[PDB]
Amino acid sequence: RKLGYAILGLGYYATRIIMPRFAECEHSRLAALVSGTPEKLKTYGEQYGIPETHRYSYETFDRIIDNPDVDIVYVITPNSLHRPFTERAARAGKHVMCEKPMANTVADCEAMIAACKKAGRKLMIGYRSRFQAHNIEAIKLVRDGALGPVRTVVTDHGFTIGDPKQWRLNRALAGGGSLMDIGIYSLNAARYLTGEEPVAVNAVESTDRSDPRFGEVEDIINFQLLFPSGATANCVSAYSVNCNRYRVSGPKGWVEIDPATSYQGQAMRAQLGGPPAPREPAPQPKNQFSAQLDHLSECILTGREPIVGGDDGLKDLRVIEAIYRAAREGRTVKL
Amino acid sequence: RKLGYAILGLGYYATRIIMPRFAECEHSRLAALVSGTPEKLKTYGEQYGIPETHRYSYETFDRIIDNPDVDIVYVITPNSLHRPFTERAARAGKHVMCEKPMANTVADCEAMIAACKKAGRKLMIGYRSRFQAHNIEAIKLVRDGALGPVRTVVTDHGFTIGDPKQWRLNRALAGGGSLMDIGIYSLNAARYLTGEEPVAVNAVESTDRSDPRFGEVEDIINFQLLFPSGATANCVSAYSVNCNRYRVSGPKGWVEIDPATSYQGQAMRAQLGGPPAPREPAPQPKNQFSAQLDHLSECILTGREPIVGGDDGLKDLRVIEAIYRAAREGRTVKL
Ligand SMILES: NC(=O)C1=CN([C@@H]2O[C@H](COP(=O)(O)OP(=O)(O)OC[C@H]3O[C@@H](n4cnc5c(N)ncnc54)[C@H](OP(=O)(O)O)[C@@H]3O)[C@@H](O)[C@H]2O)C=CC1
Ligand SMILES: NC(=O)C1=CN([C@@H]2O[C@H](COP(=O)(O)OP(=O)(O)OC[C@H]3O[C@@H](n4cnc5c(N)ncnc54)[C@H](OP(=O)(O)O)[C@@H]3O)[C@@H](O)[C@H]2O)C=CC1
Ligand SMILES: OC[C@H]1O[C@@H](O)[C@H](O)[C@@H](O)[C@@H]1O
Ligand SMILES: OC[C@H]1O[C@@H](O)[C@H](O)[C@@H](O)[C@@H]1O
Numbered sequence: 001r002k003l004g005y006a007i008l009g010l011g012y013y014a015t016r017i018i019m020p021r022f023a024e025c026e027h028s029r030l031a032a033l034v035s036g037t038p039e040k041l042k043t044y045g046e047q048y049g050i051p052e053t054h055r056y057s058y059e060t061f062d063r064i065i066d067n068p069d070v071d072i073v074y075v076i077t078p079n080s081l082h083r084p085f086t087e088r089a090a091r092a093g094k095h096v097m098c099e100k101p102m103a104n105t106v107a108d109c110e111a112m113i114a115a116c117k118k119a120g121r122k123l124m125i126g127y128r129s130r131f132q133a134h135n136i137e138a139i140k141l142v143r144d145g146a147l148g149p150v151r152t153v154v155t156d157h158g159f160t161i162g163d164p165k166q167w168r169l170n171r172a173l174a175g176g177g178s179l180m181d182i183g184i185y186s187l188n189a190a191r192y193l194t195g196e197e198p199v200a201v202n203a204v205e206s207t208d209r210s211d212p213r214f215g216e217v218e219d220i221i222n223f224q225l226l227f228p229s230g231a232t233a234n235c236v237s238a239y240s241v242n243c244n245r246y247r248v249s250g251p252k253g254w255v256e257i258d259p260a261t262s263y264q265g266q267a268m269r270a271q272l273g274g275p276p277a278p279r280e281p282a283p284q285p286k287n288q289f290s291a292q293l294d295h296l297s298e299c300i301l302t303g304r305e306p307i308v309g310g311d312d313g314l315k316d317l318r319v320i321e322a323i324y325r326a327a328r329e330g331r332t333v334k335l
Numbered sequence: 336r337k338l339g340y341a342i343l344g345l346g347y348y349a350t351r352i353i354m355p356r357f358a359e360c361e362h363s364r365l366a367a368l369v370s371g372t373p374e375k376l377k378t379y380g381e382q383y384g385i386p387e388t389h390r391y392s393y394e395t396f397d398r399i400i401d402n403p404d405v406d407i408v409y410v411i412t413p414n415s416l417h418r419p420f421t422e423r424a425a426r427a428g429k430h431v432m433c434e435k436p437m438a439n440t441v442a443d444c445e446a447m448i449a450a451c452k453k454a455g456r457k458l459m460i461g462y463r464s465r466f467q468a469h470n471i472e473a474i475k476l477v478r479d480g481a482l483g484p485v486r487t488v489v490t491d492h493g494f495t496i497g498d499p500k501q502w503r504l505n506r507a508l509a510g511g512g513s514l515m516d517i518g519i520y521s522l523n524a525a526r527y528l529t530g531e532e533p534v535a536v537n538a539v540e541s542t543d544r545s546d547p548r549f550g551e552v553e554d555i556i557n558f559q560l561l562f563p564s565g566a567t568a569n570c571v572s573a574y575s576v577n578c579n580r581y582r583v584s585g586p587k588g589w590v591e592i593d594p595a596t597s598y599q600g601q602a603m604r605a606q607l608g609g610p611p612a613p614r615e616p617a618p619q620p621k622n623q624f625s626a627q628l629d630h631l632s633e634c635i636l637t638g639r640e641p642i643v644g645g646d647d648g649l650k651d652l653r654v655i656e657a658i659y660r661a662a663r664e665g666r667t668v669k670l
């Protein structure tokens with residue numbers, strides 16, 4: 001049994017990364033395309049064998065309610081559009097995969113969750129790293145007690161963003177700067193490595209407003225998290241440096257991945273009672289993208305809840321709001 | 336042409352690390368011993384060929400003023416004793432090398448600086464990393480513009496401390512916990528990699544007071560620094576995990592060392608234009624310890640100021656006070 005995906009928003013991630021990876025799925029198939037660019041519907045419709053009956057504009061998208069080949073809509077648009085397309089998908093009776101960050105605000109996340117609940121449909125956020133072999137290995141090491149209690153998580157995510165005109169640098173479409181786009185990986189990792197939710201947050205922002213990229217959103221916003229167990233995290237979020245890594249440490253040792261949450265190329269090193277050494281993770285059945293797609297499908301087929309549901313996305317936005325507030329107010333924000 | 340060192344406080348660092356390294360010095364020699372343990376004066380005096388005329392107790396130390404073979408006193412005691420022995424050394428007409436952290440407080444550092452200034456004698460703090468090959472190379476890459484402007488410094492220093500009864504875990508002798516002893520390397524590195532002084536500080540403390548080690552001083556205190564250029568630093572200080580590293584990053588690339596500030600074994604990796612790759616630093620004539628020793632001697636011989644004078648030690652204590660305050664008050668402390 002394969003559930004049918006409609007891919008909505010035929011941009012870079014949709015077309016270069018996600019759509020080719022239906023090849024390795026076991027419970028998912030590409031069934032429909034939704035785009036605001038007619039030429040893309042032609043181009044990708046022809047490449048992927050999607051008939052014209054299964055091609056939608058944003059104007060005709062609500063008609064997808066009458067298409068039984070579509071079980072799931074995967075929303076891969078700028079951040080500010082996640083909420084309205086998720087709600088429309090839910091009202092069309094479809095389950096929803098929504099890219100990160102879930103939405104611009106806590107309230108918007110709550111609205112999305114309510115819409116999917118009202119529709120009796122599932123909602124999953126695209127945290128692909130939870131399906132990635134090295135990340136799974138790190139999480140398991142922590143849970144097995146190989147490090148002892150988690151004491152520190154040090155995680156850096158950033159890239160040198162380019163074109164100042166792109167939607168990521170536009171507040172109305174992005175909802176925020178580096179934290180919304182790439183820093184969220186540092187936050188999400190601190191949460192899944194500790195398995196906890198933070199109770200206190202510090203942050204410092206640094207943005208050169210004379211830079212043509214940064215008239216509207218932030219460049220650097222680094223943050224600290226404290227967790228109930230006493231675990232701590234130091235996190236970097238940046239649009240002016242390249243980094244992608246984390247190290248989690250406890251009294252018995254530590255494990256790190258660098259790059260950690262990239263599309264490929266993960267490398268893990270660990271220090272666990274002996275010397276620091278490369279560590280190969282247990283093999284996964286398929287790549288993180290196909291695994292992410294199949295997870296939602298399998299949840300629907302078995303009546304289970306996604307491991308990264310709307311609530312996970314909401315929990316991130318809750319902390320993101322606190323990070324922005326901590327930097328704005330120059331004080332520790334309690335959660 | 337060698338200046339005479341009196342080593343004061345014949346503990347681990349003095350006897351196992353420093354004293355053997357006079358061997359590679361070009362302008363420094365071991366001339367005297369000062370100790371509160373008679374057996375050590377005998378043991379090390381005989382081992383290093385130091386005559387009884389050049390052996391002092393803490394009670395007879397002030398007599399060192401009449402010993403023309405002694406040019407410099409190197410104070411290698413618990414932190415709370417740095418100030419009185421430095422002042423006594425200064426009043427005995429000797430130049431002073433003092434171990435980090437300089438003293439317990441800003442006020443104590445100011446007193447030490449004033450005592451050496453009054454005596455017309457030089458004061459240097461034992462920041463050996465400034466003479467270590469990989470560290471010099473990282474500073475050079477930054478200075479030469481290899482990274483572009485510094486945007487982030489991420490640095491972690493910690494070790495799993497053991498015996499609860501040792502002076503480092505006693506507030507009266509240590510002046511504080513991990514930040515005084517090992518976290519100061521994170522701070523000092525953030526300062527010499529940026530070449531700047533911080534203007535804002537955040538901090539989070541995490542200490543289990545039920546742990547036998549941590550009845551009096553702190554375990555983890557992580558901190559954030561903002562610098563005037565816009566550069567940022569995320570720093571870890573810990574007594575319950577092992578770490579020793581930094582990465583400094585700018586728009587053009589980054590460079591890291593892990594271990595960064597160990598006695599030996601430094602390894603550098605850099606990302607400059609292409610994938611991260613190993614980098615061998617420019618070679619140094621002498622190891623970091625001998626180089627540190629000779630630096631003070633050479634400054635005295637040439638009438639120049641140490642690159643790590645008392646004001647460097649003071650600048651660290653100023654930030655350390657801010658870090659402790661930021662963690663206590665849960666707010667960004669301005670400097
Ligand atoms: N999990 C991951 O690893 C990644 C997740 N993402 C997430 O995917 C989403 C899209 O990112 P990416 O694909 O990089 O962005 P792109 O700009 O490359 O594609 C965005 C697409 O959204 C559609 N769109 C609809 N309305 C607008 C609008 N007003 N302005 C611009 N585009 C619009 C367009 O598709 P059409 O022309 O068909 O309308 C556009 O091509 C973001 O939420 C991002 O966070 C991105 C990269 C990686
Ligand atoms: N730069 C570096 O890499 C390092 C710097 N250090 C610094 O060196 C100093 C000492 O560290 P370490 O050598 O590890 O400490 P140790 O405990 O090994 O040596 C401390 C010595 O100081 C003397 N001393 C004087 N008064 C006291 C006292 N009241 N209680 C205990 N000892 C006393 C003793 O020597 P005696 O018996 O001769 O009186 C004792 O052996 C500290 O300031 C530390 O920060 C330490 C390690 C590395
Ligand atoms: O892996 C890095 C990628 O992560 C994505 O979630 C971000 O949206 C992209 O901007 C980034 O390039
Ligand atoms: O990191 C190596 C050493 O650095 C010193 O400055 C600290 O005092 C020691 O406690 C530590 O072992």
Ligand SMILES: OC[C@H]1O[C@@H](O)[C@H](O)[C@@H](O)[C@@H]1O
Binds near residue numbers: 616617618620
């Ligand atoms: O790491 C730098 C060091 O490498 C050593 O192998 C060389 O002998 C030293 O001359 C040099 O300073």
